[PDB]
Amino acid sequence: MWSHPQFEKASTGREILEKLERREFTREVLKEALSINDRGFNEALFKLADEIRRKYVGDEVHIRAIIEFSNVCRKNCLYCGLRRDNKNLKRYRMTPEEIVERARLAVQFGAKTIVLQSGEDPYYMPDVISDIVKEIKKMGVAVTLSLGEWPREYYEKWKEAGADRYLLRHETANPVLHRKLRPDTSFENRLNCLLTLKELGYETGAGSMVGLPGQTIDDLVDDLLFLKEHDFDMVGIGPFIPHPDTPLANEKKGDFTLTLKMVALTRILLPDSNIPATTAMGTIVPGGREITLRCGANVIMPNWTPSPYRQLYQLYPGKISVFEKDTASIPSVMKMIELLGRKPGRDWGGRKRVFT
């Protein structure tokens, strides 16, 4: 028997970068990219992702204004502050008039997509959502829904009402962990919803949380390969942020750098996808969204939920700032985009097929 020494780190990193540039996306390559803790490797990975972003989605940063119109949820996900067992949290629902008029104001401020997100709140489902969507589509903008898991019939009604996109983050592709963290449902259900949305012709968004309890680097690799397999139009990635009024209150927070590497690898794997710099990235690090927009992201989703509701959509701590008026976010993100040397989107920013 003979020795078995490891290879030097910088050269291994350079070999990983070469494999990523040649698009040799083996599990071992993705695992090693996620595992290397060298600032200079990571910077090269971010620059690769940024290059691919420049080439295949360009310099426009698309603005998607989010209205979080109800924090009522029938589910009990272990990570989420809106879980039904959290009795500390004041619940609210916006009327259709409040929602439509608030959407009109975002359109006037220049948002070209309105995102309607909520807890899984049966009050609205399906017909109130259809009515709201029809009204917002008259404003000349795209509509994205992010309402959770519903029957195919509901998704079909909302498509006929005019919805363009659906964001249903897959959370984790590990089916054992998924069920542990989402005890009402399953990864199979979540995937069936994503497949139905695609079949109905939505632009479909998935994406995971990074740093969930029990999640490993091998699970993150499976998330990347899941995203690649389905060629999602949008991918929403952010860190898990523990919420004090949930069973996961005392667990580790997701790591910003690891999450940024997931965004970068997602852009490399899916060159023409729409990738937000998520709210959670801005919560975890000051300037986190700006950094993420330099590491492969091309979308920003300012929070347009009005007072007094905004502060109650408490998915995780620190999500909401109440230091400025509730109309500040769209101008703010426009200034951010200008300071980055980017441009706001000129059209609805739908996913295009320009890579291969």
Kindly report the CA angle at 201 between 354 and 110, in degrees rounded to 5?
Answer: 70
Closest listed residue to residue 140, CA positions, set 107, 98, 169, 187: 107
Of the residues 278, 292, 314, 329, which one makes contact with ligand CYN according to CB under 6 A = 278
**Interface characters, 113-132, with ligand SAH (x: CB under 6 A):** ----x-xx------------
Q: Give yes or no for residue 144 binding ligand CYN (CB under 6 A).
A: no
Closest listed residue to residue 84, CA positions, set 148, 13, 177: 148
Question: Binding partner of residue 83 among ligand SF4, Cl ion, ligand SAH, none, CB under 5 to 8 Å per kind?
Answer: ligand SF4
Q: Which is nearer to ligand SAH, 13 or 266 (CB)?
A: 266
Of the residues 53, 64, 157, 178, which one makes contact with Cl ion according to CB under 5 A = 64
Q: Give yes or no for residue 296 binding ligand SAH (CB under 6 A).
A: no
Q: How far is the CB of 115 from ligand SAH (least distance, A)?
A: 10
Of the residues 148, 205, 302, 349, which one makes contact with ligand SAH according to CB under 6 A = 148
Q: Which is nearer to Fe ion, 13 or 205 (CB)?
A: 205
Q: Give yes or no for residue 71 binding ligand CYN (CB under 6 A).
A: no
Q: Give yes or no for residue 275 binding ligand SAH (CB under 6 A).
A: no
Q: Which is nearer to ligand CYN, 176 or 328 (CB)?
A: 328
Pair of tokens at residue 305: 């939920």
Q: How far is CA 86 from CA 70, 148, 246, 247, 344, in A?
A: 15, 18, 7, 10, 38
Pair of tokens at residue 343: 């441009």
Closest listed residue to residue 120, CA positions, set 77, 87, 79, 160: 77
At residue 217, what is the residue type?
Answer: I
Residue 109's SS3 state is: coil
**Residues numbered 54-93 forming contacts with ligand SF4, rule: CB under 6 A:** 73, 75, 77, 80, 82-83
Query: CA-to-CA distance for 161 and 116, rounded, in angstroms?
Result: 14
Is the bond into 151 cis (omega within 30 degrees of 0)? no
Query: CA-to-CA distance for 46 and 295, rounded, in angstroms?
Result: 5
Residue 317: which region, alpha, beta or left (left: phi > 0; alpha: psi -120 to 50)?
Answer: beta
Residues near ligand SAH, by CB under 6 A: 79-80, 117, 119-120, 146, 148, 168-169, 171, 209, 238, 240-241, 243, 280, 315-316
Residues near ligand SF4, by CB under 6 A: 73, 75, 77, 80, 82-83, 119-120, 148
Residues near Cl ion, by CB under 5 A: 64, 113, 144, 165
